[PDB]
Amino acid sequence: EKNYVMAIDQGTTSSRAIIFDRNGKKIGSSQKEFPQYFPKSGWVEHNANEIWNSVQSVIAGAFIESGIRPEAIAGIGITNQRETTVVWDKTTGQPIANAIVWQSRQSSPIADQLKVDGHTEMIHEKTGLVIDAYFSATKVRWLLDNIEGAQEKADNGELLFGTIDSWLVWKLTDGQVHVTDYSNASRTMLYNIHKLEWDQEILDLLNIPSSMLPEVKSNSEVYGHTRSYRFYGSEVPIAGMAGDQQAALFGQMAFEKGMIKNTYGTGAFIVMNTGEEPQLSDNDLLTTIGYGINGKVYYALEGSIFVAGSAIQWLRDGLRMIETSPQSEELAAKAKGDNEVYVVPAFTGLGAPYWDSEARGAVFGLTRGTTKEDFVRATLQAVAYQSKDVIDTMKKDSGIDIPLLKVDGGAAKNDLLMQFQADILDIDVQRAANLETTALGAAYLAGLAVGFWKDLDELKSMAEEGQMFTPEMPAEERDNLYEGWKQAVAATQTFKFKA
Amino acid sequence: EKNYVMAIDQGTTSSRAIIFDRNGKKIGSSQKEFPQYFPKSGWVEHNANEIWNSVQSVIAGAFIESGIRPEAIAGIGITNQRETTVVWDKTTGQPIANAIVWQSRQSSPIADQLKVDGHTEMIHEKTGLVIDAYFSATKVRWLLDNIEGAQEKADNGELLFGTIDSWLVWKLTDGQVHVTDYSNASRTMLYNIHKLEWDQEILDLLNIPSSMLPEVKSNSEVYGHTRSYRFYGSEVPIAGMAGDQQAALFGQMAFEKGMIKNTYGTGAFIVMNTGEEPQLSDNDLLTTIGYGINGKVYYALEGSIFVAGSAIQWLRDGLRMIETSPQSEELAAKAKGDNEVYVVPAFTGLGAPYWDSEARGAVFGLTRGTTKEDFVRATLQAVAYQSKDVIDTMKKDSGIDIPLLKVDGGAAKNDLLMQFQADILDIDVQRAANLETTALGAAYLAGLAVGFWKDLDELKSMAEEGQMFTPEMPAEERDNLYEGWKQAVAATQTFKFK
Numbered sequence: 001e002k003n004y005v006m007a008i009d010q011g012t013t014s015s016r017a018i019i020f021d022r023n024g025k026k027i028g029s030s031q032k033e034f035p036q037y038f039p040k041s042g043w044v045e046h047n048a049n050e051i052w053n054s055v056q057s058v059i060a061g062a063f064i065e066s067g068i069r070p071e072a073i074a075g076i077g078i079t080n081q082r083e084t085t086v087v088w089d090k091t092t093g094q095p096i097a098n099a100i101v102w103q104s105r106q107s108s109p110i111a112d113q114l115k116v117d118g119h120t121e122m123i124h125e126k127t128g129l130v131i132d133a134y135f136s137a138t139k140v141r142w143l144l145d146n147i148e149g150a151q152e153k154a155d156n157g158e159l160l161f162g163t164i165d166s167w168l169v170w171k172l173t174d175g176q177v178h179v180t181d182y183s184n185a186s187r188t189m190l191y192n193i194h195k196l197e198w199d200q201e202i203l204d205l206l207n208i209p210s211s212m213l214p215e216v217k218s219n220s221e222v223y224g225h226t227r228s229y230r231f232y233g234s235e236v237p238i239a240g241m242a243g244d245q246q247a248a249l250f251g252q253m254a255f256e257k258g259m260i261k262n263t264y265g266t267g268a269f270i271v272m273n274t275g276e277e278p279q280l281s282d283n284d285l286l287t288t289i290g291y292g293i294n295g296k297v298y299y300a301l302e303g304s305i306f307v308a309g310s311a312i313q314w315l316r317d318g319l320r321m322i323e324t325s326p327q328s329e330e331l332a333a334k335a336k337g338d339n340e341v342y343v344v345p346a347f348t349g350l351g352a353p354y355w356d357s358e359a360r361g362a363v364f365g366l367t368r369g370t371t372k373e374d375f376v377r378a379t380l381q382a383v384a385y386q387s388k389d390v391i392d393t394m395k396k397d398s399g400i401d402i403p404l405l406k407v408d409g410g411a412a413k414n415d416l417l418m419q420f421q422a423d424i425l426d427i428d429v430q431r432a433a434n435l436e437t438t439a440l441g442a443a444y445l446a447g448l449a450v451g452f453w454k455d456l457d458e459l460k461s462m463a464e465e466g467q468m469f470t471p472e473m474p475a476e477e478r479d480n481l482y483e484g485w486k487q488a489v490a491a492t493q494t495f496k497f498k499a
Numbered sequence: 500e501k502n503y504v505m506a507i508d509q510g511t512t513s514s515r516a517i518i519f520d521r522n523g524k525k526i527g528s529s530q531k532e533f534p535q536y537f538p539k540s541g542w543v544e545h546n547a548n549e550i551w552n553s554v555q556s557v558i559a560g561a562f563i564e565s566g567i568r569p570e571a572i573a574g575i576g577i578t579n580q581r582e583t584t585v586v587w588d589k590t591t592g593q594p595i596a597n598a599i600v601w602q603s604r605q606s607s608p609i610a611d612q613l614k615v616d617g618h619t620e621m622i623h624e625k626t627g628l629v630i631d632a633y634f635s636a637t638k639v640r641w642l643l644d645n646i647e648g649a650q651e652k653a654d655n656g657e658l659l660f661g662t663i664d665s666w667l668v669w670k671l672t673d674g675q676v677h678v679t680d681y682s683n684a685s686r687t688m689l690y691n692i693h694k695l696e697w698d699q700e701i702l703d704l705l706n707i708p709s710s711m712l713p714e715v716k717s718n719s720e721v722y723g724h725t726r727s728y729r730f731y732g733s734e735v736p737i738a739g740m741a742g743d744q745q746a747a748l749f750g751q752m753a754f755e756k757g758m759i760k761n762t763y764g765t766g767a768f769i770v771m772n773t774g775e776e777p778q779l780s781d782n783d784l785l786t787t788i789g790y791g792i793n794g795k796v797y798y799a800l801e802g803s804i805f806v807a808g809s810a811i812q813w814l815r816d817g818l819r820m821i822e823t824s825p826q827s828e829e830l831a832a833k834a835k836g837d838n839e840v841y842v843v844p845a846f847t848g849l850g851a852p853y854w855d856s857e858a859r860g861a862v863f864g865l866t867r868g869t870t871k872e873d874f875v876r877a878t879l880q881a882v883a884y885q886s887k888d889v890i891d892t893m894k895k896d897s898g899i900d901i902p903l904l905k906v907d908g909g910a911a912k913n914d915l916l917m918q919f920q921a922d923i924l925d926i927d928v929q930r931a932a933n934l935e936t937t938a939l940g941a942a943y944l945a946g947l948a949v950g951f952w953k954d955l956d957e958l959k960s961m962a963e964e965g966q967m968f969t970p971e972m973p974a975e976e977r978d979n980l981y982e983g984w985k986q987a988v989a990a991t992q993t994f995k996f997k
Binding site (some may be wrong): 003057060061064065069070071108228229233459 | 555557559563568570728
């Protein structure tokens, strides 16, 4: 088996599977959505079993659409939505409850307490992260706290913990392998990214038994093989794992220190390669592991913009102002205003570089002359503004001048938005040839593990330069646009009603 | 180890796979639509490959929803839309062009020429059918006439003909088995339903090389085994095949002469079992093979109503009066009129017992008070009216009485309509517990072939019995409503197109 590699990308609202040849071309792909659950305001959950089914469906779909046999797959790469947490019974394999998604805030009481108990610096020094409900640590605690006899069962070695990648590999191997990779582990807030080990102090602190934790490994090595009856008779090698944003960094071939990217999906995530040394200030940002390969660990600086695509999804199902997501492209392209309406989509608090979990969504500059087209254009522009907030924060934290910026993700399909993005940044923006650089990065990792590709230089030559965007906006126009934004965000932060 | 049998129903607009257990309980299912192509008006085509992919999709989706493993499948039953034709290269395994659907009128000129040259009584004698673009025979002639190199490649033995059941089995077995069952064969208009063999006179008459033809076997027996890479990982016995309407007859357990059923889907087909011998006149109706099992062959009497659910689909996609097909029911219920409006949806001509290809869709009795609810309602009742036309024709023809009519199919969801059907027919109407009796029949034929079930008696055991519908409409109202219909249809037939 060795002519194609398969990549699985389990996302926030959908799953996808793509089969690639030794040249990096999509021979076929499938994509399927799965249910989102909002039990209380701010709470966001997923049914781990429904995610597994969305995954079985897209793996099948890609085989069908491509017409190739499973016994022809050299290896499988897995990339997933990070932080999302699942806890399940190792004997029945059944989740003890719904999975808590990275977007959820249901574990805020727990994260707030950790700050009050003064663990902020300790956590950051060990994990490179900031205490918040966003990471896995507090989600496991929430589950052990609110599920009948779960903590007691946990103390007995019956319950397992895992991010989506561990959940998937566990399923693919029918309970034989319980593993995860450096990047996913570093996003848990329970993993020391310097010593490269689960941190006992933080585990004791949260009363989480270490018997729940999976083995941590590199992003490119054979973790195991699919159970024959779990992959159509064939035992295919699972050889690549990485959080979707890290997988995207790799897929953009940003291997050199300093190279930076931005992926536009449910959220926007700006990631920069910092090399084998996280040696620099990371004030107002996160320090995580980009990837571990060839016996080495590469670090990264990241800025999280939680609401990007999910805002357009909001204009569709919330305000019902838009009919379909792609229609926002056309509506914003008909705005006759002068850009003074600002939308700050902090539905679940402001992300990097603000990290203000109290703030909520807000809109400024409204006048009777403001149309639906203006409101929609302002919603789309928000992700472009916060991206600059992050990039400019990154330049300060490293000095590293940024002359270029690679971008990818579905929301990058918008030519106008990409031009706006480059105009306010005042730097070049290069869009990937094919938007799915995440599934591509997962495939590279698996490929290198099974020798599908000789090494990094071979992937480089396999590049494919894509659409380039250049600044063309007057210096006075972007200065004002951004200044207005800064004031809108400042205004949004002054509103902290607490009933 | 087994305990389950799968049934694949490849329909007109979508495909579905269902996994059943010893008790006939639906354990898992999956449905998926595939593209419909309308090149020129009246034409309807499918890409056989996309049909193939839709089948793989629902097969996978059925396992996934059930958690059942493929190696636990005792057998596979297959049913399909019945006349749709596909011709392909036996070597490359590729179709020479899109499949022509049963709905398509593109082969009409060919059929008209045959009735002109006076071949009607002959085809009818031999096949039990009427000459029409509806059946496979003229569709194959069409493809050979219009596809470059086809006739030569077929004369040279490179091309194969097949209805959807034959196409799928060829796929599941990766070109190892080219076969079809009695029920599907009888519908090609190239099969002699009396001598049970492909008719040499009709073939030579349509210039169709016999080498294109599949072997014709019974509806219940092991045709072969899937190739592991063709069936979600393993080798499973393909043990049942039947046209969708005959499989529905079998799933309603209409095993005896006189037992009749109606299936409401894209079209509506009324089928009555006639036994081991036709033995009767079939004026205005079709005589076909119901199915072959236990070394015997059972015939059926069929009345075809081409447009039923597709009319509702037209209101949603054509005129756009409704947002979603289920909305039609809500609207019809709200109708405030007095039932004086008639819709005769003969989009491609009138079916049984009229068989008038020159007729087109018509509407009668409009007034300025006629509302959308009135119009939607009239469209829905149309199937009930023509169904009564057919039942009355079967009665006149057979002499057999019809106290009970079994019904199934998607459009059988509508209680208000089944009640209307009962009121008009003045007969009881028993709806099936599982409206998907087509997939159930297919599973039965396969179960029996592999021993999943021992005989027909064990099947009649697990009979559930759905909701019953009894007449509760005054005699005078029924006779008026139906009288208006006959006059609406009479007026529709006076307007001849081409």
